[model samples]
Target chain A: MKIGSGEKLLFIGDAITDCGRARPEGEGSFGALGTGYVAYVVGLLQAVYPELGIRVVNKGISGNTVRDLKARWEEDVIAQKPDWVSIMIGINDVWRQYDLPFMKEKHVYLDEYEATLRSLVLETKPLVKGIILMTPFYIEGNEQDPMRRTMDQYGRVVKQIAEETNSLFVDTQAAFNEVLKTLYPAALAWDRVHPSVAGHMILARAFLREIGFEWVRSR
Target chain B: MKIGSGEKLLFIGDAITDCGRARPEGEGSFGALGTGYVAYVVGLLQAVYPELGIRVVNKGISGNTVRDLKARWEEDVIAQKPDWVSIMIGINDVWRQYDLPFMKEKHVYLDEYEATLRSLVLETKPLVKGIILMTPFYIEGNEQDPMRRTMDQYGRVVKQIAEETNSLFVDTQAAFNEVLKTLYPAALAWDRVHPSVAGHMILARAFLREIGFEWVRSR
Candidate 1:
């Protein structure tokens, strides 16, 4: 696996990544991981690669977009001072424009989504040993779906940033698409946005795949 | 292209699908295919594949569900005897739950949704050259939202039936989710149920996609 022994992996993103992890600083026991993909990924990593003894932390907030990361970058990301940073955002950035269309100023357009995300990745790149950028996704299977299309565009931005910054990229949408052949969008994510446990697993698997996580390993 | 030249395609669904199509059978002339996706679909099919000379019809009703369709099945669907039948329902099936929670009889549960939809697809499979099962959608983006969540469940039934019946599935919700990323649900459907012209166009595109309607013409 790309993650080594005693390495610290930190996750930062919106609600899907959040799942109500320990407020401010998510870590320790009692479900501090917030019961989402962060927890799932951590669990799989520890169970399969117990020899690694990696430390994981999740600093995710509900309804957060790339803009929110900008506001909390100093404290949430930089302060934690970890080995790896996994980011999954942009849902709210595109979502608000749709759910609250009238509030023009509140919306985060493609330009802003791109600029803020690129800036964050660049800022965090030098601080961490490795950076993992996860593309934001809408659960809809139809590539042509409006939200899915925009999400792909946003995911493209992430891919670009990852390439530019020399970070590992995880296409979260590709993970879900595998399951979506038989399952409806709502099966994984009711809103075609947030995910359920099974949905979170898709994310966990996707993240692990990028990190070279070995499902079967011997100590 | 799945659709053959000179073939007839008939559509049936709720108010969103109906959009005031003409009478018992909708065909020919101004607004005959209604003011929804059916007409828009007809326009695009003709404009792009004019040489094929495909025939289109709309038989959607104002307020419909699987129950309602079953009520008029023989007369509306089998009698029409079209090569391709596009079926979109479940809006009222799920919407009725929120609108009249206490009225148990007024509601259509998952079991019934599954059964009714399954029965209809099977019956139509042998008669029609092909079948299209389009999912029901709630305009709301919040998957956790009461009505939207319910709508997603109903939509799932649509997908299952599509799979079991070997029918082409048009994720109408997929169509909207993409647009919803940039545009608000209100813009698509003011009540978050009924659709505007632009919204209908999304449905039209989604439906057309299943039948191999290419935007660019090789002709």
Candidate 2:
């Protein structure tokens, strides 16, 4: 497994990552990991590799954009002093554009999206052992959908940043697509963005896979 | 405390309780308790009273009504056989009325709501030591709103059933109202129904209080 024992993994992002994690830093006990993929990731780690003694912290804020992450990075991530930082952001960064077209201020364009994300990753590269950049995905199977198309563009920026920074990248959109083949978008998430439990599992499974977490079953 | 050690507590309800928990029976390691009040409750129990060895099971399905509960009570509750049951239902039971006015088929009236809930509680009463009936709440502070007013009526039904059957009743509406005094409705939940982390915390706190869960200090 890429993740070693006693290492701390911190996740930061928008509402999808937030998933109602506990306050003042969601970690340790309860559903503090929030009710989404983060918990699933932690649950899998603890259950399969209890000896790893991994420490996972969730720092997701609802309705957050890349701008929001920039505002809170020092305190939310830097001060926490984690061994690894996993970020799955840019949904709201792209969403605000279409949802509120006229509101130019709220929109984070492709240029800003790329620049800001790259900056966040580069700055944090030396701070932690590694950084994970997960793409922002729209659950709709139709790649032609306006919002879906726009979300993909933002996702590309995430991939590029992950590559440039030499960090692990999780193609969350591709993971959802694997499941989207059989199920409709609504089956995963009614809104086709915020995932349902099954949808969140896709994210959790992908993150584990990227980190080389092997689900070894004992007979 | 009302809850004893080595007991199993099972929670059944709608989206609020469901909150994207693991599927095919949301229990065991990981976020099986879900990310809502259920997780917070278990988190608290495990944190403050780990010796209790409390087992919490979450069988809440998103968009479920009390009618749905009746359909699965046998498999979800009785078959699992928990020591205690905590239920927070009836949001979708009343929500369909306003959100989908023409869809009368989906609407579950107060009479049916009361009868169905009471039946579920009564049947489970003989099997479990206690049943906690938490009132369904609309986070909107304006009790005068049509949805809020209707939601109150359902809350009353939960209260009445709890009293008639001598079960523990939690006025979830009253709990949200306490915070609504200072914060706006959107602050807790955008739709005033689905809770934010803070809003979910309110529900968690109320459930714990009802069970006489006290937070002790540690050095």
Candidate 3:
């Protein structure tokens, strides 16, 4: 799909998606699209489709749960009026339960996560032609090793929402799993949640593939 | 400038640098290292220099000022026992002033900014072998346009510290300025505070160069 003139793209999630964007550049701020997967993805897209005249926004706030995200949805997601919206959230929703066990549970996670995604779909669907949903992924036995159990539930819920909403689902969790089969998770992720360069590259490729672009062969 | 077997990498600054690593990956947890330049840099370092055996931490918080940074110094910076520390700050100092002009002024910025760097240098000097200080760069002609007078003041202070401290300085502001001469600020940024794809790449290259690595040529 070719983005038209003056088209806009927005990425929202947690730290993985923020991508160091909060810092001032010339125009916008950074987010989970940090200097990792998000930056690279935008670089490739702009290079190839410069004609699209696309503007990208990253609004992934760190330490945010589905509840937290809902709190800022109006300011972060909806206000931009994006033509395309990509969401990769959930890791925190599960991880928080471990650190603050009393605050969240599985039932609560499923209910809250579904609610957030459903709301995003309802609001942005009218404005955007496409929705990109990425599954939350984590490798077992790293920074969040013991907490992996909770994180996984968040990942699962994201995938389910993608299917339910008929949005473009790029299974980052599955992709990471596949890559892990060849290389250990530690190689791609320093801790379990954030991607290293290779991990971010893997993510960029997943996004490109889902969007029907061949970034690897050409690059 | 090779990181030794037991080298430590301590990151200091605002939210973009934080990546919310404290949160675990899961159904609803914040992402570790919250997706940004730090994630990519850490990943690349780990991947390329597996032998380095580096220890890294991101001690950043959202909505933090230089004074706030000083307050967290003991817990966030000094206690980490780092061999190397990279600092990226000043935007918030500049940003906050704009948002609260009547309440804040230039003197507050210089004083807090200088104090933060001095505290880090004084405390970390004996234990740390290297410190990399990065200048704050912004996308001009947006919300930041109003703050150039203040941002320049902050940049000058950074240069002075580098000269006085004999620390390695990354001139991110200058590099971004160079790019803007050829490309519109809007081309590399959206709101003039964070980077777009081109903006991020510019920063990535500048950061790599500061660390004495040619990211563009090598990667």
Candidate 4:
């Protein structure tokens, strides 16, 4: 999506986005970006595209669902006044369904999940110059696996919302799936949820590509 | 060594010490401690000994040897005014000998390695309350391997220096060797040099124990 000079890019979502970002506001001098793909993306952008002078912020809270995002959208996302925003959520939303099946109230079912995310995206779409909606994914290679299938379903919802909102879309699952062909799921995500350093690189690569990043070999 | 309250601790070395530490000064209100054993050590110190309020600094530079460290010692370490200093070096000093055997000039031989490190320690010992001299080691189980033998020799030099200077000593190699009994070298360090998260933990544990850190578990 050809991010321009002096663009403020803010990313929001669940733990994948959180990765221990600074509290209240996740943008500043000290490792406020957290130690995940968000930090990598910002580091790469700063290194490779220093001329662009992009400002990036992370507003992800661990264990947060789409409903949680909606609740804090104004304070975390909208008030920040970013030119572009990227969000990747739904892991815990789907995880609680299996990890705590009896806690039905905690689960963000497909219907409300889609509506809340769509609402948040639409409300902020007019406020921001653009939006990048990222699909939350499980590192499992087997699409037929129950949790994998359910996670894929959530990813599709993100896709539909992105398309309906005319925002940029990043398919992080497809990116991991490419490497999964050669590497085990454990290589990327030890627990099939949290990603290792390599996994974070995969995510950064996927996000960068969507923004027209040119990856070339150097001598 | 029991660190006193309000003491400043500084760590300096090669890439192992650098671990992506912030440039210029690697200490502040951030993860400037880098992402390796140095950061792991700082985190444990804060968690277990918060009252001591020990300030830690990282002055590690990737691709550095003892000579390189000597060049920047004044600005990076001595000038920082740390109460205690910890140094873990010699990996690249030994690595270059094996990786680039023909480039003999690039390698910092054992005599120079020990002399330069000892000089640094002696110069700083009277200024600081204590100094930690950590040996650089190879993670190989076979102690007889050429690189492992060479590394052990370097580690011994560090030990000799520690004994001569009466400084605190941390055998990081012994720490990894203990883990290598049950785990493969790949489990700790993928390339047999830079450590994984688990490998960093090993280094951290070793350094902590030398500084009067008590290890006991309670449920």
Candidate 5:
């Protein structure tokens, strides 16, 4: 797709949102997108358009819960003032409490996760042209094993919030679930939380599908 | 493995090496290795031993030949006075001539290519410490097709020069050949020349195994 001049997109989430980016000042790109998704996605821009001056920043912080994202949202997300904000959070919100036991509340998870997204939408509204939301997914039986059942509660809350907020909703969890039916979950990821490069590609593909970019012509 | 305070490494290659780093200061690295063996190697250094204090520089211009490198040697290679210079070039030295047809002699290719490495070695000899030479490789059936016989000739020149210079030779072509037998060439690389992350990782593995850092660890 032709990323117009001075265009910037920011990817944010918990640790997954952190995506290993310590400082995000460039094309919405931060540290490691686990395995080359940012590189792969940005490369698509360079190869096809060559001239599109799109900026991508990845500011995913690993091991962060939704509460953590809210804690640092101002310095990390708000100050950047991106034209578009893409987020992949919620897994940690649910996974942490489920796995750590210290994370012991279903109600607090739903309310806090929604409150954070709602705050971003309200704060950035009108100015933030787009908001991309990806679902939090865990493998069928590992790491956060019970996540498969409890995780959807978080996804439902996210869906409810995305709908109420009128932002773009991307079902990365759904998209990848389709992939999981055909490929083994282990093949798709190294652990239950992060997507391998291939998994990230699948997630990116789903995001592209959610928003139509006619300019991004044939693959 | 750890890079020492005294150790210096020089990267030489084509655009993959150049990584959009502007001329002159391009040697300092373009933020991060753009997407090649160089970046992956740097990542390993940071992840395993961030305190190693290795001075790694990339002098790979986007489009360069042996002659181009030789022309910039004083500025790019020698000025920094690298302790260990790693050179992986020559694909474009021949690839460009396929269509130009007013092609230079194969001997011209051998002489210029060897001369560049020789100059670096002769200038820094006793203090340089190590010189590593990597063989040029082409993907199977495309750039490496039998019909494209001239490429093999260029590969031979690279091999012969490594021996003549007494450089630490990295038989990348052979190692890649072994990888190609098991993995699809497309998985490691997209174009016959450039590598994907997996391909770069494969190269990194080969590099680690080649020397095992056993010598450097004691330091």
Candidate 6:
């Protein structure tokens, strides 16, 4: 699962992914790569595998849903011509339904969520060498929690899409759950949606492990 | 040099230090620490010395001169009551004088520069357990270049102040100059001012070494 030399990896999703990425040019110097799991992944990739010369880009935008991602897919994803693409979304899609229930029109239900995500995956599968579909997560221990249940449902949808499209799958929700067993949800994220450095490290570890990144690689 | 348990370390400087730190609170969830040498220092400190439980804060703002630091010093520095404080500035002090030489008022002259920095060191010396004085640097090869020469003079001022104040000193200029021996100036920083990840690592390594951070401690 190691990336090849000169491979370009582009990651896009919601605020969880966006963190604070620089617009138009998110891969260069001056901290354009933002301050999230994307930066961690990119940093570790560059640091541990400097010889690979991998190019990682962040196109995540805060408060974006699956529909918003679809709207900008052509420009943000296709136009970049990346060798690999990773998508971690659905947090906002579920969050809107709960946080702003009265604004029903803004809600992206399970049907639309699955449809739009699948559409993006199928559309891009042919164009890139590989695609990584990461499940959106809620850092709550109780699976019975309304938001947690909804988020888990969306995670299931991502798994279905990954299986159908044969894309690499990252169960980010499970990754957080494993840590939630010991650390309380608040310890990871006060909002339970946005992550701290600890939560971001969880996402980075899950993603890196999926790609078979060896933490103790020899220089 | 080992930091006691529950010590707070505050870093203050200019854009190179700023990276993209979150406003108001520079150390918390959602990557408020920004993406620069500060983050690397914080990340490594936490990773290697989790039991120390040290708190690291970033008060760096982009494009800020020593005057700006002086103006905000009370709120951003003194009020924070950090156990240890690290200051890496003077790039813009020299940069403004050279890049905007016509704006005579903006330039911080050698006399004023040394005096102001020494004043700050003296003022803050008694309040903290230790203070680290880091010299501003240019990632250039030819030491005789006008900007590099002037930057060296400023670095010398920082060294003098550190000695006078009995504060820890970090020669960030020498730290980067050693790397420039093998890599071109552009490889570290295209403008020979703002650093890339590689340059930031140099800064982080230099700072960590001064504090006696053991990189290969048994896990």
Residue by residue across A1-219, what tens digits does model 4's lDDT show? 378988999999898988999998898534787987787677555434445667889998999998888889888888899999998989988999989999999999999999899998889899989999899999899999999999999999999999999999999899777667755776446789886555665677678889887532132
**DockQ of candidate 3, scored on C-alphas against the true complex (2 decimals):** 0.13
Backbone clashes under 3 angstroms, per model: 7, 0, 55, 1, 21, 0
For the second chain of model 4, what is the TM-score against the true structure's chain B? 0.95
Model 1 chain B: ten consecutive residues of lowest lDDT: B182-191
lDDT for B71 in candidate 5 is 78
Model 5 segments more than 4 A misplaced: A1-219, B1-3, B27-32, B102-108, B141-149, B213-219
On residues A58-121, what C-alpha lDDT tens digit does candidate 1 reach at each position?
Answer: 8999988788889998998899899999999888898776666788877889999989999998
Work out the TM-score per prediction. Answer: 0.57, 0.54, 0.54, 0.56, 0.51, 0.68
Q: lDDT by residue for model 3 over B1-219, one digit each (tens)?
A: 345666777777776566455632211112455555665556545434444556667676766667777787777777667788888888887787777777764325677678877787777777788888888766663334657667777878888888888888888777666555545676666666665555645555566667765221242
Best candidate (score: DockQ): 6
- Candidate 3, which segments miss by more than 4 Å at Cα? A1-41, A44-186, A189-197, A202-219, B19-30, B105-107, B141-146, B186-189, B216-219
Comparison by DockQ, 2 against 3, better one: 3
Over all chains combined, what TM-score does candidate 1 have? 0.57
True interface contacts retained by model 1: 0.17
TM-scores for chain B, in order? 0.96, 0.97, 0.83, 0.95, 0.80, 0.96
- Native contacts retained by model 4, as a fraction? 0.00
Tens-digit per-residue lDDT, A1-219, candidate 5: 323556777777765545455454433222233344455455444333434556777777777666776777787777888788877777877776666775475334667777876776677656776777777777554324567777777777778778887777877677656545545566545566765444555555556556564322455
Give a tens-digit lDDT track for model 2, residues A1-219: 888988999999988888888988788745687877787677656545545767889999999999899999999999999999999888888888888999999998999889888898899999899898999999888899999899988988888888888999999898777556655776457778886555665687678889987644333
| Candidate 1 Cα misplacement greater than 4 A, ranges | B1-219
TM-score of 5: 0.51
**Model 2: interface root-mean-square deviation in Å:** 14.9
TM-score of model 4 (CA atoms): 0.56
Which consecutive 10 residues in model 4 chain B have the weakest lDDT in total?
Answer: B43-52
Angstrom error of the Cα, residue B39, model 3: value is 1.2
What would the per-residue lDDT of candidate 6 be over residues B1-219, giving only the tens digit for each residue?
457788999999998888899998798634788877888777666544545668889999988778778888889999999999999888988898888989987788788888888777877888999999999998887989999999999999899888888899999988777566665788557788986776776777688889888644554
Question: iRMSD per model?
Answer: 7.8, 14.9, 5.9, 17.5, 15.0, 4.3
For candidate 5, the per-residue lDDT at A17 reads 49
